Amino acid sequence: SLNSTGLAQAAINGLNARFYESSNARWSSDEPWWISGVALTMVIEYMRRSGSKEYLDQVEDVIEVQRQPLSWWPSGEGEFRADATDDTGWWALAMVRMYDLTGNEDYLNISIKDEAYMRQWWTDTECGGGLYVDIQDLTYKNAIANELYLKLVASLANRAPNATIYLDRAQQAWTWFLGSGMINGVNLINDGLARDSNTGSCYNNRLPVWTYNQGVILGALVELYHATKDESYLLSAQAIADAVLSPSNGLTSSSGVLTETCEGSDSCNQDQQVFKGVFALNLAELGDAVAGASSDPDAGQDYREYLDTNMQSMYANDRSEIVPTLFDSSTGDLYDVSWSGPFRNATMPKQASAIGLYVANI
Ligand SMILES: N[C@@H]1[C@@H](O)[C@H](O)[C@@H](CO)O[C@@H]1O
Incomplete structure (x- = not known):
């Protein structure tokens, strides 16, 4: 299968080797x-x-x-x-x-x-x-x-x-x-x-509608739930996350892959390239809070399944490795903006957004 911990480290090493x-x-x-x-x-x-x-x-x-x-x-x-x-x-x-x-x-x-x-x-x-x-x-x-x-x-x-x-x-x-x-x-x-x-x-x-504006709010509601023990905050957060996962809203593709609105026109700037990873990290925080707030073993299964689906598509269609040389022994993985589209280049915001998806699956 796929080990997110080893891929997160490989992605972090590619971030450092290229951009630090x-x-x-x-x-x-x-x-x-x-x-x-x-x-x-x-x-x-x-x-x-x-x-x-x-x-x-x-x-x-x-x-x-x-x-x-x-x-x-x-x-x-x-x-x-x-x-x-x-x-x-x-x-x-x-x-x-x-x-x-x-x-x-x-x-x-x-x-x-x-x-x-x-x-x-x-x-x-x-x-x-x-x-x-x-x-x-x-x-x-x-x-x-x-x-x-x-x-x-x-x-x-x-x-x-x-x-x-x-x-x-x-x-x-x-x-x-x-x-x-x-x-x-x-x-x-x-x-x-x-x-x-x-x-x-x-x-x-x-x-x-940007993806990171549907993620940071999830983490805020999780902290509000932790401070009040009031599940009303979790239920509002679950409504925002469910709307993102619904393919009828244009943020989740027919393949089930998270897609920024600028990916179609190929016009995602340096800010928009990092948005998706921020959402995935906050969604995994929501899923952890939902699974602990109830005794049902399927609690938060849709959020974990969503992150697993997106991690596999990025792994297979968006990956590229650095060339090791006789001098530089640096290894890792590089990633582009589309978590289903092709790899053409790698930028620091795209790489940081890719790290967040792996870390969300750990
Ligand atoms: N102060 C602005 C920010 O508001 C903005 O988010 C970034 C975006 O590059 O540029 C500047 O740093």
């Missing part, structure tokens, strides 16, 4: 900085799920260098506080993951500083809540920045000392998200909100 820069403690400086944060999350989650620790030294190096004041946003004063609330959000959740792996309180402190940073741009005056993504411009309250924040306050509600304040924030934040209108008629989440030019009211902008 030892002189910068970062993957691919030519790619968005926040995707290096997603990459660290995939590697941390691999170690936590496989019990390994082979990349712990490398990961600790990345944190030490990237936690310094960013050259393009010095006013953030480091600790992953950047010029966009979602850029900060990806690194903050990675620090929550590292705290889960190591138990070192230093990493939890970074998440606490990041929560207080992002909360600065939550306003009740526009759309009745939510935070902005563009710290400099302050014109867009989108879905991904509010999903990252919601999963951050919900995670702190289970780990931080002053857990009650964080639980109140998460409960008020989910209530705003649910009532914002970003969740549409088929329980899928569009990109963000638009504002009426005359009334000041906000509404679903009907922008595309």
Whole structure:
């Protein structure tokens, strides 16, 4: 059969062999900085799920260098506080993951500083809540920045000392998200909100449905369930996941393979190339929560079967290996954007999205 642990390591080795820069403690400086944060999350989650620790030294190096004041946003004063609330959000959740792996309180402190940073741009005056993504411009309250924040306050509600304040924030934040209108008629989440030019009211902008906007929200609801023991959060998360798995919604193909909307026109940019892996990692978190919340042995079987179906299609149609030489003994696997389509090239976001699918099957 297929061993996801050995393939996750092979995919991580291909990511490092092709894109890691030892002189910068970062993957691919030519790619968005926040995707290096997603990459660290995939590697941390691999170690936590496989019990390994082979990349712990490398990961600790990345944190030490990237936690310094960013050259393009010095006013953030480091600790992953950047010029966009979602850029900060990806690194903050990675620090929550590292705290889960190591138990070192230093990493939890970074998440606490990041929560207080992002909360600065939550306003009740526009759309009745939510935070902005563009710290400099302050014109867009989108879905991904509010999903990252919601999963951050919900995670702190289970780990931080002053857990009650964080639980109140998460409960008020989910209530705003649910009532914002970003969740549409088929329980899928569009990109963000638009504002009426005359009334000041906000509404679903009907922008595309991206896969990672259906995943981060699942992990936030799992943390909310863990902090309240209320299964109502799991049932809402299961409705969002079921809509993704339904082939009638255009995100799951007739073969059962997850497909970004940009794959048909072959126009997935550097951001969209990483989306699918973020969903698969969060879906596996939902499945673990569903299987434990009930005694039925088939609990969460559809989510595990879905991840297994997608792992096999990527393995067979999207794989390519690096050429070993007489000098470089580097080995591993490379992957493209389509988890069923052909392999043409490999980019760091595509590779990080592929790691997440294997780690979701561990
Ligand atoms: N600050 C922006 C982010 O909001 C955005 O997500 C990335 C995308 O590349 O570019 C910049 O870093």
